Symmetry: D2
Subunit: 90 residues, 4 copies
């Protein structure tokens, strides 16, 4: 799973650039749920029936909105990653 | 950039499992910095000199701590992505 | 609690949880002053819940919110 | 200062999150206690107040009475 493929797969199915607030609201919701999963100690790599409410799920759900926000804000995350590599060597 | 490779690269240069709070704190810091960037409308794909403060950089920095929390919490994001695919299709 | 960092870490988790629930309630437009039967999930409840953990964190971190407000007011006029 | 209310709410919500980010930093760094004026910048005290400030600003624009809400919550908890 390439990171630019994740971003574009998410763009294929969930892209409403006139609803930028929707996506920011959702990011913050998922970070709240993540806080809860970490507080409860729901760590490790869940099977399918362990997934709901796990640190793993909430980590992914935050990632989803990172990517969804990137599409909305015209951000290429893979190209941004690369520029950060340049900064981190200089 | 493969997602597993990103997670694995971050773990090479930043992995302290006895400091789980460090990483959660840092996540919240970046989300606050991301919020500033969206508020200030610093959208688009920046060149190297436009990178500091950009929506692009803050989304990346948030991505970074999602991955680094995944490493700390024993989460495989790519495996978790696959599982979420299954639940979403149902 | 009695070990201070565990208390702080708890209230900080809860702070982020409520800020999440507040985001949802703003998204859904659950504004105004609710009666009791509309309290759950309202913006009002979530704003109170966030306020609650702010205050809880101030107690544990040795913060006087009222004296902090006054210090901020000097900086403001300055 | 703001005339269209969703725009005022959106601003205050962005600022609230910004301030929560800054509070996270002040806690990570252990900047606890009650500071004098020279120690206020970047302290836990400052960020707590700053978060408190936007909670209130957001309550004003959403038509929330925090005193009455607190009272309603107390009735619930007792139940
Ligand atoms: Mg979730
Ligand atoms: Mg940053
Ligand atoms: Mg709540
Ligand atoms: Mg501040």
């Amino acid at each position: 799973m390439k990171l630019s493929e994740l971003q574009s797969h998410i763009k294929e199915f969930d892209y409403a650039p006139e609803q930028s607030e929707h996506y920011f609201f959702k990011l913050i919701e998922e970070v709240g749920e993540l806080s809860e999963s970490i507080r409860k100690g729901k760590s490790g790599q869940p099977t399918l029936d362990e997934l709901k409410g796990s640190v793993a799920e909430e980590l992914y759900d935050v990632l989803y909105y990172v990517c969804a926000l990137a599409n909305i804000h015209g951000v290429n995350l893979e190209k941004t990653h690369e520029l950060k590599e340049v900064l981190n060597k200089v």
